[PDB]
Paper text:
Here, we describe the structure and function of gp61.3 and show that gp61.3 inhibits the lysozyme activity of gp5 but not that of T4L. In 2002, we determined the crystal structure of gp5 that showed that gp5 consists of three domains: an N-terminal OB-fold (Oligonucleotide/Oligosaccharide-Binding fold, gp5OB-fold, residues 1–129), a lysozyme domain (gp5Lys, residues 174–339), and a needle-like C-terminal β-helical domain (gp5β, residues 389–575). We hypothesized that the mature form of Spackle/gp61.3 (residues 23–97) functions in the periplasm to selectively inhibit the activity of gp5, possibly by direct interaction. Combining all our results with previous work on gene sp and 5 mutants, we propose that the main function of the Spackle protein gp61.3 is to inhibit “free” copies of gp5 that are not incorporated into the virion during T4 particle assembly and thus can escape into the periplasm.
The structure of gp61.3 was determined by a single wavelength anomalous diffraction technique using a Se-methionine substituted protein. A 1.6 Å resolution crystal structure shows that gp61.3 is a fully α-helical globular protein. It contains 5 α-helices: helix 1 (26–34), helix 2 (37–55), helix 3 (57–70), helix 4 (73–75) and helix 5 (87–95) that are connected by short loop linkers. There are three gp61.3 monomers in the crystallographic asymmetric unit. Barring different rotamers, their structures are nearly identical. In two of the three gp61.3 molecules contained in the crystallographic asymmetric unit, a calcium ion is coordinated by several water molecules and the main chain hydroxyl groups of residues Val94 and Glu97. The thiol groups of two cysteine residues Cys29 and Cys81 are close in space, but not close enough to form a proper disulfide bond. The distance between the sulfur peaks in the electron density is 2.43 ± 0.06Å when averaged over the three molecules contained in the asymmetric unit. As a global average of billions of molecules comprising the crystal, the crystallographic electron density most likely depicts a superposition of the conformation with a disulfide bond (which has a length of 2.05 Å) and a vast number of conformations in which the thiol groups are greater than the Van der Waals distance away from each other. Hence, even though gp61.3 is a very small protein, it appears to possess a novel and possibly unique fold.
Residue numbers in the entry: 23 to 97
């Protein structure tokens, strides 16, 4: 997804600050769309990191954030 202010914050704020909110944003989508996947997605975020989603979640006009679960659990 894209939002001008969220895009700028995600690219300028402290690394740990953005990383913590990315995880919370993903878990919120998991709770809404695949609530039983909470423990599994949490395990995948810890092993694979979340900062690789810095661009697609806040700066990408061509990424639908609903697809973040499939992105995380896929290879
Ligand atoms: Ca992965």
């Amino acid at each position: 997804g894209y939002d001008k202010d969220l895009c700028e914050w995600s690219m300028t704020a402290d690394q740990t600050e953005v990383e913590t909110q990315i995880e919370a944003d993903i878990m919120n989508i998991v709770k809404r769309d695949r609530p039983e996947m909470k423990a599994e997605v949490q395990k995948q975020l810890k092993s694979g990191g979340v900062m690789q989603y810095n661009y697609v979640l806040y700066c990408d006009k061509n990424f639908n954030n609903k697809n973040i679960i499939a992105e995380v659990v896929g290879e």
